[PDB]
Amino acid sequence: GLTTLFWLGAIGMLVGTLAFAWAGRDAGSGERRYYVTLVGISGIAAVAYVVMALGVGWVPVAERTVFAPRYIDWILTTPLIVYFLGLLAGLDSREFGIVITLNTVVMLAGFAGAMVPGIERYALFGMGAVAFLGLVYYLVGPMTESASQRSSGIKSLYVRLRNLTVILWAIYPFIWLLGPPGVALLTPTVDVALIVYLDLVTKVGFGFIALDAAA
Amino acid sequence: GLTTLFWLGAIGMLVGTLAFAWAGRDAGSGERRYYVTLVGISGIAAVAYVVMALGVGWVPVAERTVFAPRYIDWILTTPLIVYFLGLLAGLDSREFGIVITLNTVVMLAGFAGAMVPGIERYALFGMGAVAFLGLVYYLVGPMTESASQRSSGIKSLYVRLRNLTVILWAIYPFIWLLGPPGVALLTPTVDVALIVYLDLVTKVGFGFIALDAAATLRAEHGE
Amino acid sequence: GAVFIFVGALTVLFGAIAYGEVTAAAATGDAAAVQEAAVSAILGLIILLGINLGLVAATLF
Amino acid sequence: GAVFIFVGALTVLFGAIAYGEVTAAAATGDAAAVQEAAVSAILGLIILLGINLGLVAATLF
Ligand SMILES: *C/C=C(C)/C=C/C=C(C)/C=C/C1=C(C)CCCC1(C)C
Ligand SMILES: *C/C=C(C)/C=C/C=C(C)/C=C/C1=C(C)CCCC1(C)C
Numbered sequence: 001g002l003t004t005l006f007w008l009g010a011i012g013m014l015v016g017t018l019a020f021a022w023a024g025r026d027a028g029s030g031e032r033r034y035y036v037t038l039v040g041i042s043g044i045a046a047v048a049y050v051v052m053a054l055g056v057g058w059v060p061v062a063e064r065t066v067f068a069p070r071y072i073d074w075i076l077t078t079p080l081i082v083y084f085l086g087l088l089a090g091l092d093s094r095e096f097g098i099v100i101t102l103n104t105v106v107m108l109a110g111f112a113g114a115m116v117p118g119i120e121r122y123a124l125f126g127m128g129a130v131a132f133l134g135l136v137y138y139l140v141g142p143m144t145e146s147a148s149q150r151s152s153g154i155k156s157l158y159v160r161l162r163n164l165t166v167i168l169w170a171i172y173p174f175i176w177l178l179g180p181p182g183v184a185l186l187t188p189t190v191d192v193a194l195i196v197y198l199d200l201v202t203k204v205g206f207g208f209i210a211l212d213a214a215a
Numbered sequence: 216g217l218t219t220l221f222w223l224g225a226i227g228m229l230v231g232t233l234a235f236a237w238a239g240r241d242a243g244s245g246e247r248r249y250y251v252t253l254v255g256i257s258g259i260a261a262v263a264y265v266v267m268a269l270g271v272g273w274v275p276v277a278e279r280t281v282f283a284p285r286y287i288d289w290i291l292t293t294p295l296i297v298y299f300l301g302l303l304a305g306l307d308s309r310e311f312g313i314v315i316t317l318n319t320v321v322m323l324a325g326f327a328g329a330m331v332p333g334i335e336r337y338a339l340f341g342m343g344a345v346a347f348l349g350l351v352y353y354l355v356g357p358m359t360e361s362a363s364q365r366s367s368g369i370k371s372l373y374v375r376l377r378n379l380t381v382i383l384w385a386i387y388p389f390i391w392l393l394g395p396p397g398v399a400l401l402t403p404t405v406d407v408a409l410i411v412y413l414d415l416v417t418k419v420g421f422g423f424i425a426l427d428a429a430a431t432l433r434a435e436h437g438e
Numbered sequence: 439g440a441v442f443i444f445v446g447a448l449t450v451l452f453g454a455i456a457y458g459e460v461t462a463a464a465a466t467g468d469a470a471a472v473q474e475a476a477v478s479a480i481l482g483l484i485i486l487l488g489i490n491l492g493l494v495a496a497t498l499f
Numbered sequence: 500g501a502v503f504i505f506v507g508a509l510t511v512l513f514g515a516i517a518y519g520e521v522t523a524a525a526a527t528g529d530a531a532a533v534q535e536a537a538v539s540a541i542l543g544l545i546i547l548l549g550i551n552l553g554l555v556a557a558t559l560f
């Protein structure tokens with residue numbers, strides 16, 4: 001059941017949101033931004049899953065269904081994840097602009113590709129895939145070097161979140177390729193189930209790791 | 216193909232056997248029987264797989280098929296693995312007899328259960344399963360204590376091999392229960408593939424771990 | 439330590455979801471429909487094993 | 500490092516084996532045969548995860 005999986009995603013995101021909200025209730029000036037960001041990451045994702053669970057934003061596109069709020073979710077929450085990582089790394093405005101731009105290209109491409117029939121969707125996929133490699137470069141290169149210049153505590157938390165992020169984000173394009181937007185070997189239910197799992201780990205799992213480290 | 220999977224098993228075991236034989240060619244007095252044991256473990260397994268790949272020993276039981284050389288392999292090689300662990304742990308004859316006995320009950324039980332129809336096969340399964348728990352207790356309890364009376368290198372290697380053994384062997388009875396001898400939800404092919412993978416890790420992987428630690432053990436007492 | 443239980447439990451859950459599609463397809467009596475559901479299940483599980491291994495590698499290392 | 504490559508690659512190999520049985524069953528036309536190959540494939544892949552995770556736990560901890 002699609003709507004059931006969507007509901008489960010909503011519940012998971014909600015519990016995450018509340019947990020993060022509660023954890024940062026007494027946060028100082030140096031931690032507040034991080035908690036607020038976590039709340040936003042899981043909170044927006046919660047809205048998207050509820051909307052999909054109510055059957056809204058399901059778009060028919062050439063013998064496949066495209067879940068619009070999923071991509072809108074991605075477009076809005078992933079740069080917040082990058083922002084969180086960027087705060088740890090100690091980036092400035094220019095550097096932030098670079099990684100958010102690359103991230104935005106990834107999400108827009110996947111969305112545009114999902115709604116385009118024929119071989120063009122793979123061209124759009126390619127745009128996203130290349131921009132993603134660019135993003136990965138910054139995370140494991142310059143941003144890692146920038147994070148290294150801070151205290152070992154911050155550096156360790158950065159690396160831990162970086163690794164979770166790079167490893168698991170890299171799985172998304174394979175689901176896209178094998179799922180409905182691509183060769184359609186994965187049924188919509190399997191595609192949705194896998195994405196619910198990944199979303200929860202890359203946002204909620206991400207958050208609890210950060211909460212543990214701040215402790 | 217079943218025979219293809221059996222050939223892969225045979226080739227894997229053979230490579231392991233030769234590597235273990237080669238590695239031990241210069242072994243000192245104190246190391247020699249460890250290499251010889253490894254050669255025996257993967258060598259017998261190699262024979263069992265070649266025999267099965269040649270289509271020999273495929274025993275029709277009701278409508279399922281039981282690969283006799285597999286269980287014979289098990290009955291003969293698993294006590295040699297236990298023996299290897301026992302040498303590391305430094306067991307005496309009494310302690311060896313206990314763990315070899317338990318191991319044998321496990322393998323006899325599984326073979327007999329595979330040959331029997333109906334509720335009885337689970338009774339035979341239960342015998343092996345309980346015996347296996349007894350064996351695990353010895354491996355993780357008394358034998359671990361025994362290994363702690365030796366050098367840190369030996370205890371280290373013992374723990375590594377013990378953990379590999381306990382974790383992976385525990386997977387075998389689930390494959391039995393879900394496969395042909397049990398409720399038959401795994402096809403023969405899938406059953407065979409999983410066991411080939413397990414057999415290779417528990418013998419050949421087991422052996423290469425021991426091989427990788429040999430130099431450290433040698434440097435530990437002056438060499 | 440606790441990641442394994444989590445990973446193991448989610449896998450049987452996803453397995454149950456996969457088996458659900460397969461049997462639903464089987465109830466149709468259409469062999470090709472079952473094939474479609476089956477390859478989806480197979481590829482889904484391969485990917486799932488990737489997520490779990492990736493989660494293990496990111497959390498325990 | 501080396502283990503995750505080994506474990507990953509073996510997962511695709513077993514996947515190919517599972518897919519092979521599924522398509523072989525689908526070539527009979529019997530939907531029940533396909534379902535039969537599919538559950539074997541699903542359960543097999545789950546057991547494979549246990550082996551992989553077990554191997555990882557054994558040799559990297
Ligand atoms: C919480 C939701 C998250 C972390 C979603 C992450 C999604 C991606 C990393 C998607 C990447 C894609 C490519 C790299 C290629 C084009 C297809 C995309 C958009 C799926
Ligand atoms: C190299 C081949 C090896 C290490 C085979 C090991 C086989 C076992 C540990 C089998 C255990 C079983 C039970 C515990 C229950 C009854 C079914 C058995 C015999 C499969």
Ligand SMILES: CCCCCCCCO[C@@H]1O[C@H](CO)[C@@H](O)[C@H](O)[C@H]1O
Nearest residue numbers: 029030031034035154210211212214
């Ligand atoms: C749950 C999320 C908690 C992660 C917050 C980690 C931030 C701790 O890092 C802090 O950053 C502050 C902001 O500039 C600075 O005052 C200090 O450099 C540092 O103490």
Ligand SMILES: CCCCCCCCO[C@@H]1O[C@H](CO)[C@@H](O)[C@H](O)[C@H]1O
Nearest residue numbers: 244245246249250302425426429432
């Ligand atoms: C194949 C890997 C080789 C492992 C060799 C481990 C043996 C190291 O230890 C050996 O134990 C012997 C008792 O068995 C004693 O003779 C000596 O203490 C020592 O040589």
